[PDB]
Amino acid sequence: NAMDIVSVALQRYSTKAFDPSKKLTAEEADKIKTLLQYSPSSTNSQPWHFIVASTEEGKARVAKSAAGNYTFNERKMLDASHVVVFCAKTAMDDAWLERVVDQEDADGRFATPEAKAANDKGRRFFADMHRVSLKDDHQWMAKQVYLNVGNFLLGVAAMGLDAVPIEGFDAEVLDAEFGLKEKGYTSLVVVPVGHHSVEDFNAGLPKSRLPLETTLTEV
Amino acid sequence: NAMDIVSVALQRYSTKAFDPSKKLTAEEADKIKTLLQYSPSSTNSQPWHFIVASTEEGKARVAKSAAGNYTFNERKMLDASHVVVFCAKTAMDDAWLERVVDQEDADGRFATPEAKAANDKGRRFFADMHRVSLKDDHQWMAKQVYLNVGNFLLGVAAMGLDAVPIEGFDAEVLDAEFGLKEKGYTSLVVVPVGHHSVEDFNAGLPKSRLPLETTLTEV
Amino acid sequence: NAMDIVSVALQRYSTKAFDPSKKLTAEEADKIKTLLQYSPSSTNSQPWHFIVASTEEGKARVAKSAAGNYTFNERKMLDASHVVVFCAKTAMDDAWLERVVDQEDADGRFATPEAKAANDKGRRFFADMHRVSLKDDHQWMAKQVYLNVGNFLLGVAAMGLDAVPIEGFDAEVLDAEFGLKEKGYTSLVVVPVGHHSVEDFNAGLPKSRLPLETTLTEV
Amino acid sequence: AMDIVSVALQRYSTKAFDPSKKLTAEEADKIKTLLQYSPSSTNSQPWHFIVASTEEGKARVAKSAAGNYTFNERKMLDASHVVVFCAKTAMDDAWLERVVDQEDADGRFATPEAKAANDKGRRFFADMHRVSLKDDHQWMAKQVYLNVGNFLLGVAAMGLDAVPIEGFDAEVLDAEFGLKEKGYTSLVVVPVGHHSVEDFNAGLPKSRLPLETTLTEV
Amino acid sequence: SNAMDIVSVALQRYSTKAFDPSKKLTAEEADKIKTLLQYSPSSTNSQPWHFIVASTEEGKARVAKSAAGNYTFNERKMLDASHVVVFCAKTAMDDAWLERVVDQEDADGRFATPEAKAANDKGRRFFADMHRVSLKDDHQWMAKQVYLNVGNFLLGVAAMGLDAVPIEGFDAEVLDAEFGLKEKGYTSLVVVPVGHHSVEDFNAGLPKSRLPLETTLTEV
Amino acid sequence: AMDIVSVALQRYSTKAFDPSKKLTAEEADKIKTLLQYSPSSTNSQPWHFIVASTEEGKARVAKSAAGNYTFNERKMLDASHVVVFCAKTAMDDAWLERVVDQEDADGRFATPEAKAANDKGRRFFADMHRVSLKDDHQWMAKQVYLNVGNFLLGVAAMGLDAVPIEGFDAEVLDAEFGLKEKGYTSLVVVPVGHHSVEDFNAGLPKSRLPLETTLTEV
Amino acid sequence: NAMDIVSVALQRYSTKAFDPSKKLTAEEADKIKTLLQYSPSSTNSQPWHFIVASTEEGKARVAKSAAGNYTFNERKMLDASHVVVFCAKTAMDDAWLERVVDQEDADGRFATPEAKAANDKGRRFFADMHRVSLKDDHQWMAKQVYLNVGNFLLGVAAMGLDAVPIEGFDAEVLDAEFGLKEKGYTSLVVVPVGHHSVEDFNAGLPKSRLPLETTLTEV
Amino acid sequence: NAMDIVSVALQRYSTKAFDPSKKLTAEEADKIKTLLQYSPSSTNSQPWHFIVASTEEGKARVAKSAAGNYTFNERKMLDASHVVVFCAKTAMDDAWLERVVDQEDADGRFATPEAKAANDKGRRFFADMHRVSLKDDHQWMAKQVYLNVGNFLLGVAAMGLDAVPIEGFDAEVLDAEFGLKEKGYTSLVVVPVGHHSVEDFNAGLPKSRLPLETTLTEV
Numbered sequence A, B, C, G, H: 001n002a003m004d005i006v007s008v009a010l011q012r013y014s015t016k017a018f019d020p021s022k023k024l025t026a027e028e029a030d031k032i033k034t035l036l037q038y039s040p041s042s043t044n045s046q047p048w049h050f051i052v053a054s055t056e057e058g059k060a061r062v063a064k065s066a067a068g069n070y071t072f073n074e075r076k077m078l079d080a081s082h083v084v085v086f087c088a089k090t091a092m093d094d095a096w097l098e099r100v101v102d103q104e105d106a107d108g109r110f111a112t113p114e115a116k117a118a119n120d121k122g123r124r125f126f127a128d129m130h131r132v133s134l135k136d137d138h139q140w141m142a143k144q145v146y147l148n149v150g151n152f153l154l155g156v157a158a159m160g161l162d163a164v165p166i167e168g169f170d171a172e173v174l175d176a177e178f179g180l181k182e183k184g185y186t187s188l189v190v191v192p193v194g195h196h197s198v199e200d201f202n203a204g205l206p207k208s209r210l211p212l213e214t215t216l217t218e219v
Numbered sequence D, F: 001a002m003d004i005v006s007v008a009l010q011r012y013s014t015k016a017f018d019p020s021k022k023l024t025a026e027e028a029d030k031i032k033t034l035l036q037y038s039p040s041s042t043n044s045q046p047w048h049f050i051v052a053s054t055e056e057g058k059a060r061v062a063k064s065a066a067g068n069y070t071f072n073e074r075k076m077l078d079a080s081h082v083v084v085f086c087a088k089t090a091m092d093d094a095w096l097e098r099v100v101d102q103e104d105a106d107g108r109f110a111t112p113e114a115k116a117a118n119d120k121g122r123r124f125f126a127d128m129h130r131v132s133l134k135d136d137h138q139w140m141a142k143q144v145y146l147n148v149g150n151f152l153l154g155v156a157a158m159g160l161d162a163v164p165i166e167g168f169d170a171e172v173l174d175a176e177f178g179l180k181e182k183g184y185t186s187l188v189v190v191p192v193g194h195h196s197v198e199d200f201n202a203g204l205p206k207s208r209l210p211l212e213t214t215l216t217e218v
Numbered sequence E: 001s002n003a004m005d006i007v008s009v010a011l012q013r014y015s016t017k018a019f020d021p022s023k024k025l026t027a028e029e030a031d032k033i034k035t036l037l038q039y040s041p042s043s044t045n046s047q048p049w050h051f052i053v054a055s056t057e058e059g060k061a062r063v064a065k066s067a068a069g070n071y072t073f074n075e076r077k078m079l080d081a082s083h084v085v086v087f088c089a090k091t092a093m094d095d096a097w098l099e100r101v102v103d104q105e106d107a108d109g110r111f112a113t114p115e116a117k118a119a120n121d122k123g124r125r126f127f128a129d130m131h132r133v134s135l136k137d138d139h140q141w142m143a144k145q146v147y148l149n150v151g152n153f154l155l156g157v158a159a160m161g162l163d164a165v166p167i168e169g170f171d172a173e174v175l176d177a178e179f180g181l182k183e184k185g186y187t188s189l190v191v192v193p194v195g196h197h198s199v200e201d202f203n204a205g206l207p208k209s210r211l212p213l214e215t216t217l218t219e220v
């Protein structure tokens, strides 16, 4: 019980081994989903999908993505209580842009149709800038997914849970395993969540970061 | 909020109108820098730099990146107490990889020479996959920065501060203003941090997100 | 008249006599009520009441206020088509403050209860400042009434109507005749509206104003 | 023929101004014309205006946006032109003589008696206020608000955005422009220009109490 | 200038129900109202009275404390008026006060001889003893003199263009305590806020009402 | 010229009246108006007045000046008009009704409810005296003195001379006019007229205790 | 009560207000009449008459003389116990001279016929000087009356009574009211006699007389 | 207080012969001066002067006025102890009117300048009425002198002294001998005072006065 978020930031770490017997409570499982849902994103475009594998059969399917050049990650994926796959939309399409603004409307953010149209115009200006002008909407959406991941990592830490972000996995394999390409998504980061085991000596190591003198300019 | 982080996630929003007379305390200024510094990143590569503008002359320089299409963002850059520019490295050089491992060593993460070397090899395994195999290191590093942004936005919300993530600025202009190109960095996101004014009306709107039924698959 | 309003400002004048046979159309009569209603006021507190006299009997009641020392204004009050009495609330009571914000809420200006509450709070702060700290709530509310008068005079001119503000009337008499003080109001300005009589030469006298060299400072 | 009612139904208080949108030279001349040609009791014109259009000028006015009112600073800096409305602090004889002489020079009086009669007629009213009621200061401040009401509807009709600000420190503002010594005090600040795409209020319906409450027809 | 039209003033004054706290008395009006309190006549010129004039915010607040309890409806009138007057009567007609009054009349030069002064004293003491010894009446007798003063005061301040209201609805015990009156030998009787009515006072515009002379007056 | 403090400082108790100087018909009406329009608690008006102006009249009043108050006879006889101030002996319901009904007839009540409330308001105070304190007799008496005070100042302001007399036999006066049965009792006699050149109190200076003693300022 | 006539002279004064309830005793009433009777006068000529009013009806008749300028003297005459009017004869007639000497003869003052006739002649010596030579008997008699008044004022003062000599009355009115002209008299001074009222102003004032250095010469 | 003054009135008589060996004591001589001084007079105007002869030379000067036709009075004037000449003013001058009121003021009879001024007005009224309206101010003043005489004769009788009022002298001679005319006085009555001689048989004669039936009307 605190408001001490910096203590959380200084105490969390990348979990290198989970205790396969320590599970998220029902409520914690609810919270982590809420964290995924409520992350911010450019223009609130929410260009993403999440898979939460919580069953042995589920994590097993996710785990298959580690099979080739990534076997050293398999254990982490199988031992954690919950395993989240962060996926990005493969394209930013009119239908999604409409869905977003229509949801904002249903949530009651526009007092007039003029306000709604101004919101929609603003969003579409940005999105067109990426798909049409810059042709970088793929990496634009991926960046939003990573923003979500940063949010999530701190969020689960604050809940007392352990996690580790994994980029080492065959995305082509994982995508196919869940039919993501057909559905319009591509997997980007996998985050197993649970509690560390006693074999995780990373839990007892000092945190390390480059000094502000290097990474920070005050102006 | 090292506990009830979900309430924080439900209560935060993008501020548009900052009160320019409500500064961060010296304690808070230090904490935000700590959040920047302690963000996770793939292999703890920390491929980033931050500019924190807190003086009027400093904020005005950042604000120049908001000319043209982004004039509406200028006020938030000017009136917020502190303005953070998130920058990514332009290329993952060997020297940066050496610097990260040497720092992990100074901080006491490796009880022996071989533990260090193992860590180094393991980091370069990933670095080379991006630098050599995929040729996507620029994007790879920019995603680390967004993870940082995500971590930051939640952190500052937990500290009771108001913020907004701004993509609406001219990165070219900003880079030139701070000589980032020659320094090896490029700006990606600007985040004004401070306290909202009584006129920041986004504070009176409910949050809107897509339902889980759409964005979440449980297995 | 939307657009060439300056010409309108330079055509209008303070009518000295009205043609008693020229009446506002039913449409014009609505317009003028809209003008009264939709005037701005500090915090939209709308601290006012209007009597619009349009019948022989109604006008004669208002004209009583012109019966002693102000008989030079009696004819304007009797011959004009519609005579409007502008009245200030005699106190900014809690009920009114509540009435105002409930109306804004009904009109859809508040997305959340937090928004309604913040608007209520802010308005109450200002009201209390005038009643309690400054003890100038009467002058404050009378000023909003005069703001309304200004808006009104220009407004009816743009409609092609003649009008004149009258301060030469007995407000004690006029109040008593309508029971204004017991209702929590008091009369401030009377404004006859209609069309000027052929005898009113002033309709084509040159406008006279102090030069800007005297009254305006540009910086 | 207007359509002035639509102007009244479409206008609102702009809270955020686009700092890059300026009045045209012609628009800027017209707002001064509006200020100047506003009505006032006996045409006493008991006022002074400051119009700030430079960044130095608006910054000076903006000092008054301090303490509880810092939230108003940004309006005053971003808007194209910021108008400060000021009332005279006392109705002096010299001003009453100035007005009537200006009317005379403008040819409002066919004869010397017309001038004299106008002068006495104004003094009848002036004296009610400064001798009998001793409220001349409040009386003049009211004329200034009349002007403000005139102005707000004027600029809306020109297609310009605005907002009337009472949340500023009049003492600071008066001192910054040395108004007390000059015989004036500031009352309302009206930033004028074009609203930002992010102006919240432009996205909100207007709200007024219904006529059933505020209007009595007889 | 014009003759004093006092009846005109009687016909215009009224009991003010709402005061404007922005409209203060002038400093000359302040001194004059105190002269009115002083120069009121009284039986035998016995001046059995004390006056509290509250002009400050702290001052009016102390007085307004008397309006708590069953008289909260009088509190606002006591806070909003420029000046508030508390009329108090003496608790006893003591020899000391009799002596004080007769000596003041001497110092003011009303007596040409000791024989004039002594007769004046004897006359006053007769009346006083009749009330305090014989009739057992003195408190009421003195209270009447204070009410006479109030009547003089109400008409007076009206003539000066001021608004006032006589208030009997207040807690005398409390008011006395607040000012340690019992000890000083006085008790509070009437409170009179003085100043100017606000536009909230609709009573200022109401016709005056009085029973017709045909009921209250016998000519003979 | 209306300066009422000047009146206060100039008025005094007249001991000797000029029997040849009468009030004008208009002054007689005016003093009646003063009696009538005096203020009183809740406007309860708990009083009756006898105005003796004939030789026969004043003499009937003068009878109350006997025994110890023989020196007051001449004042009552020599004055133009002699006012006897009387209080009700009891505040009865019928009088309370009469007052409120009169206020109603005079148009002081916008609604039947306003009238009812005025009634309750008065009875709130009446009952505090009638039922609780049991001091209504004295309460009304005090209203009469208020009237006396108002009257003394008024007639002085009219330029008339007067004196408040308590030195008379009230029982005798009451019996002479049948007051007890009518429901009243006499409290104060005030002769009104003009002083004779042998009214020497007119040559004495006024004397009051100093404010230093009688006034607390806060 | 021992005789101290100078005390009486120093204590007496003109009473202005009489107590109407204080009467002379029957004995005092005889005594004041004895005073009037036994006053000296030149040659014992006694050229006088006295009205003594003791009834309300009586004094009212005398008080009529106090009108116009002298109405202020009415209350004295009405309030006093006894009011005395001193009247002088209007001519010295032979019948009166005869009456006086016959009275002296009846009272036993003359031892011989010569004595009586000598006294008669001697009185006429003086009487004729006045009514024949100087032609001033009117004044001469009126002087005797004033002599009587001086005797009287001091006498009643010695009796413990208060009084005042009134010249302020209309003699013509008083004369007519009593049919004095026809009777051969005229009124000169009125002296109310009785007891002062507690409100007699003059009773509390010091006597004032000019100093002897001014009024007296010693040789 | 209640002294037996009537007895004095009934015992006094007009001395016909004085005992030249009997003198007033110094105290008696002070007293009679007081009697002269303290006499009342109309408006206290005190229109008089007194010469008191008590020496052989002084009495002889007064006695010159008895030469010629009045030698029958010579012995009284020479044999008495003190001889008082009563003189009236020849004119009531503003100067005297002023002296009187100023003396009343010095004696402290006036509480305020208002009182003094009224008294001075009242007196001047009366004075003017005599000197101007009636033209009888000589007689008016002479009457006051007689009043004084009457008061004196009873006064001195009460002191146990003998006296006699004398009119039979030559006032022209008496005036001349004391330069009275230039001083503004004229002599009116001479009153020798002392003790009668054994030879004055008149001391024991019955007193004679007309009956009240003739001289007094009671109403």
Ligand SMILES: [Cl-]
Pocket: A026, A029, A054
């Ligand atoms: Cl679950």
Ligand SMILES: [Cl-]
Pocket: B012, B013, B014, B015, B153, B162, B163, B164, B165
């Ligand atoms: Cl944010």
Ligand SMILES: [Cl-]
Pocket: C008, C009, C010, C012, C013, D037, D038, D039
């Ligand atoms: Cl105009």
Ligand SMILES: [Cl-]
Pocket: C210, C211, C214, D098, D102
């Ligand atoms: Cl000018």
Ligand SMILES: [Cl-]
Pocket: D094, D095, D098
């Ligand atoms: Cl000027």
Ligand SMILES: [Cl-]
Pocket: C044, D205, D206, D207, D208
């Ligand atoms: Cl609105």
Ligand SMILES: [Cl-]
Pocket: C044, C104, D206, D207
């Ligand atoms: Cl609004």
Ligand SMILES: [Cl-]
Pocket: D209, D210, D211, D212
């Ligand atoms: Cl409506």
Ligand SMILES: [Cl-]
Pocket: F072, F164, F165, F166, F167
């Ligand atoms: Cl009395």
Ligand SMILES: [Cl-]
Pocket: G095, G096, G099
């Ligand atoms: Cl005869």
Ligand SMILES: [Cl-]
Pocket: G165, G166, G167, G168
């Ligand atoms: Cl007289």
Ligand SMILES: [Cl-]
Pocket: G044, H206, H207, H208, H209
């Ligand atoms: Cl004789």
Ligand code: NA
Pocket: D053, D054, D055, D056
């Ligand atoms: Na500029």
Ligand code: NA
Pocket: D202
């Ligand atoms: Na719009």
Ligand code: NA
Pocket: E211, E212, E213, E214
């Ligand atoms: Na009547």
Ligand code: NA
Pocket: G179, G182, G183
């Ligand atoms: Na006769």
